[PDB]
Enzyme design. Structure first.
Site, PDB file in Angstrom:
ATOM      1  N   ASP A 174      39.856  18.658  75.923  1.00  0.00           N
ATOM      2  CA  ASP A 174      38.951  19.693  75.427  1.00  0.00           C
ATOM      3  C   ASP A 174      39.301  21.040  76.038  1.00  0.00           C
ATOM      4  O   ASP A 174      39.203  21.221  77.260  1.00  0.00           O
ATOM      5  CB  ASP A 174      37.482  19.366  75.743  1.00  0.00           C
ATOM      6  CG  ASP A 174      36.543  20.348  75.102  1.00  0.00           C
ATOM      7  OD1 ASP A 174      36.151  21.323  75.781  1.00  0.00           O
ATOM      8  OD2 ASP A 174      36.215  20.148  73.919  1.00  0.00           O
ATOM      9  N   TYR A 176      39.114  29.761  77.403  1.00  0.00           N
ATOM     10  CA  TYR A 176      39.505  29.168  78.681  1.00  0.00           C
ATOM     11  C   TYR A 176      40.853  29.708  79.151  1.00  0.00           C
ATOM     12  O   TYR A 176      41.213  29.505  80.294  1.00  0.00           O
ATOM     13  CB  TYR A 176      39.543  27.643  78.632  1.00  0.00           C
ATOM     14  CG  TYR A 176      38.246  26.974  78.246  1.00  0.00           C
ATOM     15  CD1 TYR A 176      37.041  27.672  78.211  1.00  0.00           C
ATOM     16  CD2 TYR A 176      38.219  25.613  77.933  1.00  0.00           C
ATOM     17  CE1 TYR A 176      35.868  27.044  77.820  1.00  0.00           C
ATOM     18  CE2 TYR A 176      37.063  24.990  77.526  1.00  0.00           C
ATOM     19  CZ  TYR A 176      35.886  25.710  77.476  1.00  0.00           C
ATOM     20  OH  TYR A 176      34.744  25.071  77.050  1.00  0.00           O
ATOM     21  N   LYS A 221      38.328  25.789  70.158  1.00  0.00           N
ATOM     22  CA  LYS A 221      37.096  26.467  69.751  1.00  0.00           C
ATOM     23  C   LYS A 221      37.355  27.926  69.435  1.00  0.00           C
ATOM     24  O   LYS A 221      38.137  28.583  70.141  1.00  0.00           O
ATOM     25  CB  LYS A 221      36.025  26.365  70.852  1.00  0.00           C
ATOM     26  CG  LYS A 221      35.932  25.004  71.528  1.00  0.00           C
ATOM     27  CD  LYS A 221      34.712  24.867  72.454  1.00  0.00           C
ATOM     28  CE  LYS A 221      34.705  23.557  73.243  1.00  0.00           C
ATOM     29  NZ  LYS A 221      35.585  23.595  74.454  1.00  0.00           N
ATOM     30  N   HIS A 230      32.274  28.017  68.911  1.00  0.00           N
ATOM     31  CA  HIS A 230      32.015  27.875  70.341  1.00  0.00           C
ATOM     32  C   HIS A 230      30.541  28.127  70.727  1.00  0.00           C
ATOM     33  O   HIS A 230      29.957  27.344  71.477  1.00  0.00           O
ATOM     34  CB  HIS A 230      32.962  28.772  71.132  1.00  0.00           C
ATOM     35  CG  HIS A 230      33.171  28.344  72.539  1.00  0.00           C
ATOM     36  ND1 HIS A 230      34.317  28.658  73.238  1.00  0.00           N
ATOM     37  CD2 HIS A 230      32.376  27.649  73.391  1.00  0.00           C
ATOM     38  CE1 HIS A 230      34.210  28.168  74.460  1.00  0.00           C
ATOM     39  NE2 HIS A 230      33.052  27.544  74.576  1.00  0.00           N
ATOM     40  N   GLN A 253      28.845  19.934  70.375  1.00  0.00           N
ATOM     41  CA  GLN A 253      29.170  19.814  71.788  1.00  0.00           C
ATOM     42  C   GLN A 253      28.170  20.671  72.586  1.00  0.00           C
ATOM     43  O   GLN A 253      28.100  21.884  72.390  1.00  0.00           O
ATOM     44  CB  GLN A 253      30.610  20.273  72.029  1.00  0.00           C
ATOM     45  CG  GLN A 253      31.029  20.087  73.471  1.00  0.00           C
ATOM     46  CD  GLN A 253      32.402  20.623  73.805  1.00  0.00           C
ATOM     47  OE1 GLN A 253      32.545  21.499  74.669  1.00  0.00           O
ATOM     48  NE2 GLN A 253      33.423  20.071  73.161  1.00  0.00           N
ATOM     49  N   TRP A 275      29.028  18.446  77.365  1.00  0.00           N
ATOM     50  CA  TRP A 275      29.666  19.314  78.318  1.00  0.00           C
ATOM     51  C   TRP A 275      28.896  19.396  79.632  1.00  0.00           C
ATOM     52  O   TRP A 275      27.717  19.039  79.685  1.00  0.00           O
ATOM     53  CB  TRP A 275      30.036  20.677  77.735  1.00  0.00           C
ATOM     54  CG  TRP A 275      29.038  21.707  77.281  1.00  0.00           C
ATOM     55  CD1 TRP A 275      28.838  22.086  75.987  1.00  0.00           C
ATOM     56  CD2 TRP A 275      28.314  22.654  78.082  1.00  0.00           C
ATOM     57  NE1 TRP A 275      28.031  23.175  75.920  1.00  0.00           N
ATOM     58  CE2 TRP A 275      27.696  23.554  77.189  1.00  0.00           C
ATOM     59  CE3 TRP A 275      28.120  22.832  79.453  1.00  0.00           C
ATOM     60  CZ2 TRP A 275      26.933  24.618  77.616  1.00  0.00           C
ATOM     61  CZ3 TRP A 275      27.359  23.911  79.874  1.00  0.00           C
ATOM     62  CH2 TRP A 275      26.755  24.776  78.955  1.00  0.00           C
ATOM     63  N   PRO A 290      29.157  17.265  81.897  1.00  0.00           N
ATOM     64  CA  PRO A 290      28.527  15.938  82.011  1.00  0.00           C
ATOM     65  C   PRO A 290      28.227  15.510  83.442  1.00  0.00           C
ATOM     66  O   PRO A 290      27.394  14.617  83.650  1.00  0.00           O
ATOM     67  CB  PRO A 290      29.548  15.008  81.360  1.00  0.00           C
ATOM     68  CG  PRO A 290      30.858  15.698  81.601  1.00  0.00           C
ATOM     69  CD  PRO A 290      30.546  17.157  81.420  1.00  0.00           C
ATOM     70  N   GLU A 307      39.989   8.511  88.711  1.00  0.00           N
ATOM     71  CA  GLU A 307      38.680   7.911  88.949  1.00  0.00           C
ATOM     72  C   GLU A 307      37.801   7.995  87.703  1.00  0.00           C
ATOM     73  O   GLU A 307      37.161   7.003  87.316  1.00  0.00           O
ATOM     74  CB  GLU A 307      38.002   8.628  90.121  1.00  0.00           C
ATOM     75  CG  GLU A 307      36.604   8.135  90.465  1.00  0.00           C
ATOM     76  CD  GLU A 307      35.972   8.923  91.594  1.00  0.00           C
ATOM     77  OE1 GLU A 307      36.681   9.225  92.586  1.00  0.00           O
ATOM     78  OE2 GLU A 307      34.771   9.257  91.480  1.00  0.00           O
TER      79      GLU A 307
HETATM   80  N1  NAP Z   1      31.251  24.153  74.573  1.00  0.00           N
HETATM   81  C1  NAP Z   1      30.868  24.824  75.658  1.00  0.00           C
HETATM   82  O1  NAP Z   1      30.196  25.858  75.586  1.00  0.00           O
HETATM   83  C2  NAP Z   1      31.255  24.305  77.006  1.00  0.00           C
HETATM   84  C3  NAP Z   1      30.640  24.800  78.157  1.00  0.00           C
HETATM   85  C4  NAP Z   1      30.984  24.285  79.389  1.00  0.00           C
HETATM   86  C5  NAP Z   1      31.954  23.295  79.469  1.00  0.00           C
HETATM   87  N2  NAP Z   1      32.562  22.842  78.337  1.00  0.00           N
HETATM   88  C6  NAP Z   1      33.586  21.777  78.385  1.00  0.00           C
HETATM   89  O2  NAP Z   1      33.057  20.674  79.143  1.00  0.00           O
HETATM   90  C7  NAP Z   1      33.993  20.355  80.176  1.00  0.00           C
HETATM   91  C8  NAP Z   1      33.273  19.684  81.332  1.00  0.00           C
HETATM   92  O3  NAP Z   1      32.249  20.505  81.893  1.00  0.00           O
HETATM   93  P1  NAP Z   1      32.490  21.311  83.247  1.00  0.00           P
HETATM   94  O4  NAP Z   1      33.917  21.695  83.394  1.00  0.00           O
HETATM   95  O5  NAP Z   1      31.478  22.413  83.222  1.00  0.00           O
HETATM   96  O6  NAP Z   1      32.013  20.390  84.466  1.00  0.00           O
HETATM   97  P2  NAP Z   1      31.885  18.814  84.829  1.00  0.00           P
HETATM   98  O7  NAP Z   1      32.924  18.023  84.136  1.00  0.00           O
HETATM   99  O8  NAP Z   1      30.445  18.509  84.655  1.00  0.00           O
HETATM  100  O9  NAP Z   1      32.113  18.965  86.395  1.00  0.00           O
HETATM  101  C9  NAP Z   1      33.373  19.404  86.912  1.00  0.00           C
HETATM  102  C10 NAP Z   1      33.211  19.545  88.421  1.00  0.00           C
HETATM  103  O10 NAP Z   1      33.032  18.237  89.002  1.00  0.00           O
HETATM  104  C11 NAP Z   1      34.128  17.960  89.898  1.00  0.00           C
HETATM  105  N3  NAP Z   1      34.470  16.546  89.714  1.00  0.00           N
HETATM  106  C12 NAP Z   1      35.055  16.018  88.630  1.00  0.00           C
HETATM  107  N4  NAP Z   1      35.191  14.694  88.737  1.00  0.00           N
HETATM  108  C13 NAP Z   1      34.666  14.364  89.934  1.00  0.00           C
HETATM  109  C14 NAP Z   1      34.488  13.121  90.664  1.00  0.00           C
HETATM  110  N5  NAP Z   1      34.912  11.949  90.171  1.00  0.00           N
HETATM  111  N6  NAP Z   1      33.932  13.213  91.879  1.00  0.00           N
HETATM  112  C15 NAP Z   1      33.522  14.369  92.408  1.00  0.00           C
HETATM  113  N7  NAP Z   1      33.627  15.550  91.803  1.00  0.00           N
HETATM  114  C16 NAP Z   1      34.186  15.570  90.577  1.00  0.00           C
HETATM  115  C17 NAP Z   1      35.221  18.947  89.543  1.00  0.00           C
HETATM  116  O11 NAP Z   1      36.049  19.213  90.672  1.00  0.00           O
HETATM  117  P3  NAP Z   1      37.651  18.980  90.614  1.00  0.00           P
HETATM  118  O12 NAP Z   1      38.187  19.711  89.425  1.00  0.00           O
HETATM  119  O13 NAP Z   1      38.084  19.553  91.941  1.00  0.00           O
HETATM  120  O14 NAP Z   1      37.843  17.484  90.535  1.00  0.00           O
HETATM  121  C18 NAP Z   1      34.416  20.157  89.111  1.00  0.00           C
HETATM  122  O15 NAP Z   1      33.968  20.900  90.249  1.00  0.00           O
HETATM  123  C19 NAP Z   1      34.645  21.696  80.461  1.00  0.00           C
HETATM  124  O16 NAP Z   1      35.820  21.583  81.280  1.00  0.00           O
HETATM  125  C20 NAP Z   1      34.891  22.199  79.064  1.00  0.00           C
HETATM  126  O17 NAP Z   1      36.007  21.479  78.520  1.00  0.00           O
HETATM  127  C21 NAP Z   1      32.228  23.329  77.134  1.00  0.00           C
END
Ligand code: NAP
Length: 288
Positions: free
Chosen positions: A55, A60, A85, A118, A169, A195, A197, A250
């Site tokens: 994604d 980005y 997006k 988006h 999303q 997102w 998650p 993991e």
């Molecule tokens: N459509 C939208 O408007 C929108 C908005 C926000 C996000 N998104 C999408 O959703 C994706 C996921 O959301 P997100 O990036 O906000 O955050 P997330 O996946 O909820 O959390 C990522 C954070 O958790 C850490 N992490 C990941 N796996 C882990 C584990 N097993 N143990 C401990 N810490 C862990 C990461 O650190 P490390 O990287 O150091 O592992 C990072 O700091 C985005 O990357 C993007 O693709 C879309």
């Protein structure tokens, strides 16, 4: 093999969209991964670990890195799902067609699996959607959808569209469980992708929650793995982000355990309707 394009013989599950396309239920998010090596490495490591869904988004700034990681992995492109997006500044029919071409070029692809609006904004999402319908008709995209749409936005779009969105999303994690929107999207056969998650880092505190910790302990899994499995068992697509090889691995290791009905309920009851990310009502930077 061609069957890999349809995710038939693999460890991960899929969700089926209303046009019968099979979307891998687990993907790698790349928001906040720097373009170039950080993104390419994360994507390549994810593919090596078994992920078949990435994604990204124009905003980005790392579509180049995503395509580089895919190519470096050596896995045939047809076996990998790519979402990107259209950003707020590119809404409107012609601007959206142009933005799609730019994204496709940066990614180095002939087609994109899923293209999303988006953010809704207020006034241009209907016209933007018409461009997505055109791209879909042209077979440039396999599936089309939206992101951060509320029931009112979807109802408004339904009055004008020829093809209803296939995906929405949205922010979705144990503190913000989107019950009303999920009911609406279930009724109308719109798949949900979560997102943030995992709560988008330590500030939100999800991975330290005591209930998740106890469930993790019972299964000898991590809290993150428990949350991802909860997403899976709710039929939600989930796109956790990591740039760390170990955590990328993991987060994939979620296919060899199951949460009980009671464990699912306990996680459901963590809901506080606490939004961590931006609000669809007022987040529309860059409009033109
Ligand atoms: N459509 C939208 O408007 C929108 C908005 C926000 C996000 N998104 C999408 O959703 C994706 C996921 O959301 P997100 O990036 O906000 O955050 P997330 O996946 O909820 O959390 C990522 C954070 O958790 C850490 N992490 C990941 N796996 C882990 C584990 N097993 N143990 C401990 N810490 C862990 C990461 O650190 P490390 O990287 O150091 O592992 C990072 O700091 C985005 O990357 C993007 O693709 C879309």
């Amino acid at each position: 093999a061609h069957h890999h394009h349809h995710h038939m013989n693999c460890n991960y599950n899929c969700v089926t969209l209303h046009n019968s396309v099979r979307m891998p239920q687990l993907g790698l998010g790349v928001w906040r991964a720097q373009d170039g090596a950080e993104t390419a490495n994360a994507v390549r490591w994810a593919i090596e670990a078994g992920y078949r869904h990435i994604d990204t988004a124009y905003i980005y700034s790392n579509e180049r890195g995503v395509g580089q990681g895919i190519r470096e992995s050596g896995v045939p492109r047809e076996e990998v799902w790519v979402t990107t997006k259209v950003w707020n500044s590119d809404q409107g029919y012609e601007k959206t067609l142009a933005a799609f071409e730019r994204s496709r070029e940066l990614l180095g692809l002939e087609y994109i699996d899923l293209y999303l609006i988006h953010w809704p904004g207020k006034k241009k999402f209907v016209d933007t959607w018409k461009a997505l319908e055109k791209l879909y008709e042209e077979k440039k995209v396999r599936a089309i959808g939206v992101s951060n749409f509320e029931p009112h936005h979807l109802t408004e779009l339904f009055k004008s569209c020829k093809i209803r969105p296939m995906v929405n999303q949205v922010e979705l994690h144990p503190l913000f469980q989107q019950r009303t929107l999920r009911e609406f999207c279930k009724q109308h056969n719109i798949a949900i992708t979560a997102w943030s998650p995992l709560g988008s880092g330590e500030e939100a505190g999800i991975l330290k929650n005591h209930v998740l910790g106890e469930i993790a302990k019972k299964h000898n899994k991590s809290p993150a793995q428990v949350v991802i499995r909860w997403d899976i068992q709710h039929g939600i697509v989930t796109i956790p982000k990591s740039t760390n090889k170990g955590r990328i691995q993991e987060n994939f290791n979620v296919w060899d355990f199951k949460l009980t009905e009671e464990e699912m309920r306990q996680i459901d009851e963590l809901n506080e309707d606490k939004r961590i990310g931006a609000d669809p009502d007022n987040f529309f930077p860059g409009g033109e």
